[PDB]
Amino acid sequence: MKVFNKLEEWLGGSLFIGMFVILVMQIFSRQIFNSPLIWSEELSRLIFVYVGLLGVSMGIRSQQHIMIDFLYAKFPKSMQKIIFTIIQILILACLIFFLYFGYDLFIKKEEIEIVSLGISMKWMYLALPLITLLMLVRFYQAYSENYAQNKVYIKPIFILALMIILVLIAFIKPELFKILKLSNYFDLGEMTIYYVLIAWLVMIFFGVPVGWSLLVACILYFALTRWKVVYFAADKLVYSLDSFSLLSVPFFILTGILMNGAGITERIFNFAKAMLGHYTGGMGHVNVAASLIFSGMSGSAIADAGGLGQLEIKAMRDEGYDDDICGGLTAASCIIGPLVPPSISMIIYGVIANQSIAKLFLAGFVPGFLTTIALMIMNYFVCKKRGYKKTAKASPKERWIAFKKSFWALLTPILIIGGIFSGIFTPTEAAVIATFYSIILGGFIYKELTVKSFFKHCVEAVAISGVTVLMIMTVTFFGDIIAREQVAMRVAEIFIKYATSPMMVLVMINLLLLFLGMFIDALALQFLVLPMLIPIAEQVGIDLVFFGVMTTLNMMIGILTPPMGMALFVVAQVGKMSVSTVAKGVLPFLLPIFITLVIITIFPQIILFLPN
Amino acid sequence: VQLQESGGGLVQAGGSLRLSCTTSGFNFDDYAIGWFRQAPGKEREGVSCIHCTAYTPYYARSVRDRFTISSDNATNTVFLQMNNLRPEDTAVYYCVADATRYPYPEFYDYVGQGTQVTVS
Ligand SMILES: CCCCCCCCCCCCCCCCCCCC(=O)O[C@H](COC(=O)CCCCCCCCCCCCCC)COP(=O)(O)OCCN
Ligand SMILES: CCCCCCCCCCCCCCCCCCCC(=O)O[C@H](COC(=O)CCCCCCCCCCCCCC)COP(=O)(O)OCCN
Ligand SMILES: CC(=O)N[C@H]1[C@H]([C@H](O)[C@H](O)CO)O[C@](O)(C(=O)O)C[C@@H]1O
Ligand code: NA
Ligand code: NA
Ligand code: NA
């Protein structure tokens, strides 16, 4: 049918709306009057497990899980089909692992009780084997399309036969899999983790998605050493999503969608263009100020670019500005988004590094302002050098009309930044209240958000968060494997041997990150270098909150370096200009970002003031 | 394969206990040896192991930097020195050994009698 093809959409959207209603009810019933709800947080997390797995299924269907195509794209087309076929087979193996070891967890936890809900801790573990049945469907469909475009090599009836045969064997005669147990053939000793690492990099640079490559590495490690333990480690695939902090990822995404779509990001631009814009090169000041004001609501740089680039480039080209600077400044000012709170990069860091997210937000607040000031100064110098004509000052009436129109919008950051700092809201409650306020703004104060549009925004927020949920729940699985083998300790010993002072350690880490971000995306790198770099930073005495801020700023540079820059591509799309023009025009504005990175690296006390 | 524990009992907060495990019946160097902990009413948790990891002994996150595991491969003995014992370490410590050298002491094949450690 068609209601089955669009099933995760209407199921995840409805579950997300229900979770949002439960959380807002909890917040109101706890703040307005003293009557806390005991069943709200656990019910919300139970719903979010299903929501995240439905998002993962959507990502499997759309083939929109993060991969590294730097070396894969350079392969000849004839040799590019065998690799893709092997990648599809590996994804199938991961899905069968999910199904079998989720059914085992579901059947092994029928006696554990959820104290607040009074329900068994299996309705949370029922999600993994259940949604996987959808994933095996959406996978096969996704394969059937690939053979239609000459992208795979095996006819999609042999894949179906293999899938059903493997599922039947898994649920009937699992012992037939003991042939594949690699510990019966290879005895690599205690140095197996370094053979499942070079075999994890070979997969990661051959085009296998990050989330699936991590799981294949875990499978290889547990097959080579001892399979009997994988039954107990697989639990990390489920309770990693039972996190109250992680709920702030699909909400902070949604509050970045309900503002571009509800037209609240244009009133802010009008306010910035009214107050500023009559300065020396003020059409770049309005750009940076709009980015700064919008960074208090969104948490992604690509959202900032896609929501403000057309307006900013149009306003700048209505004043005679060159194409290069128009495309470069609107790309360089994106990075203010994931720095000023809220930010999804810092939420991911706090999840991976087990750090407080409120303190990460407070720490990253200041570098956002520093970067904004540096970008404004560099833009002023560039414009005064190029001799752009100063635009006439707006009348004292337009500057007030714009503010009066875009007045309720400006209060959104005060809810978040002033709510987390004051201690009234936890970051997840801040996300829920911000989403509720954005709904009120776009539906009852500005009257531009319908119900179908709101549901579509919820569905696409679920879809976007589902591609990070998979990586979260597989990096949690891989991290314990990599941390019991003490690999980070060995790498830290090597780093200290080659770099003596801790400042040299910071410099070398920054250089490695800068080199890698040129060819690797900022999201396919946070789950590749951070899980191993965080323990090294902890060992060499680096503060983890400061390290998180520094790594976020170092990876936000990576979307501007033009071997592979997402911000450059987005700005090129929205500005109707070549990627090369944007890449060449952003070079003048990389210098202030480097200056900010240096002065926060060698002055750590700047970052750690608001948290402390 | 036989493993017998030694040392234990009750101490205050920071008693710096010293558990020992005298083991026989195998090759001391080819077998990964270690200790795991089971609380009075909790799932077993791995504590430490030698010969498991390639370079350095494995330590649990909550026993790191205050537990040290040492070898005595002349009398075939494994020592676990615990310092700064928090009142949450009241449990039973079991000495384990396994032919597979991987840092998972709670899933090791062989296990000793165990010793009660109380911290008040
Ligand atoms: C046209 C050509 C196309 C080729 C297609 C190839 C298809 C096969 C691909 C792999 C299939 C998925 C494997 C991963 C998921 C495994 C599912 C769980 C299996 C399982 O638990 O079996 C145990 C035994 O198997 C075990 O002991 C597990 C061993 C296998 C685990 C994975 C090993 C790595 C993958 C192998 C790579 C090399 C070969 C590649 C072809 C249980 O048995 P029990 O008695 O212990 O439990 C029962 C008492 N509790
Ligand atoms: C973003 C993607 C990844 C970014 C980083 C890599 C980018 C470029 C990729 C090219 C490869 C660069 C080097 C990485 C090697 C990873 C595996 C290290 C293990 C290794 O090969 O040496 C071991 C020696 O142990 C030792 O004494 C050395 C241990 C060194 C451990 C380093 C592990 C890093 C894994 C990557 C994590 C991400 C980066 C974090 C810094 C075992 O030797 P063998 O068993 O192969 O012996 C072969 C003879 N039979
Ligand atoms: C577009 C893409 O593939 N990756 C981008 C991700 C995704 O938008 C993710 O879904 C949400 O973090 O966001 C960034 O990390 C960000 O703005 O901070 C930049 C990165 O280039
Ligand atoms: Na932000
Ligand atoms: Na912008
Ligand atoms: Na780049």
Numbering used by the authors:
A (entry chain A): 1 to 612
B (entry chain B): 2 to 121
What's in the article?
A single molecule of Neu5Ac is bound to the aperture formed by HP1 and HP2 in the central core transport domain. The Neu5Ac binding site has a large solvent-exposed vestibule towards the cytoplasmic side, while its periplasmic side is sealed off. We describe this as the ‘inward-facing open state’ with the substrate-bound. Neu5Ac binds to the transport domain without direct interactions with the residues in the scaffold domain. The majority of the interactions are with residues in the HP1 and HP2 loops of the transport domain. Asp521 (HP2), Ser300 (HP1), and Ser345 (helix 5) interact with the substrate through their side chains, except for one interaction between the main chain amino group of residue 301 and the C1-carboxylate oxygen of Neu5Ac. The data clearly showed that the Ser300Ala mutant was inactive, whereas the Ser345 mutation did not affect FnSiaQM functionality. The structure shows no direct interaction between Neu5Ac and Na+ ions. However, we observe a second lipid molecule (Lipid2) that is bound between the stator and elevator domains only in the Neu5Ac bound structure.
The import of Neu5Ac by many bacteria is mediated by tripartite ATP-independent periplasmic (TRAP) transporters. TRAP transporters that manifest as two- or three-component systems consisting of a substrate-binding protein (SiaP) and transmembrane protein (SiaQM) are of particular interest due to their absence in eukaryotes. The second component of the TRAP transporter is the transmembrane protein SiaQM, which is characterized by two distinct domains: the Q-domain and M-domain. Notably, the transport of Neu5Ac by TRAP transporters requires at least two sodium ions.
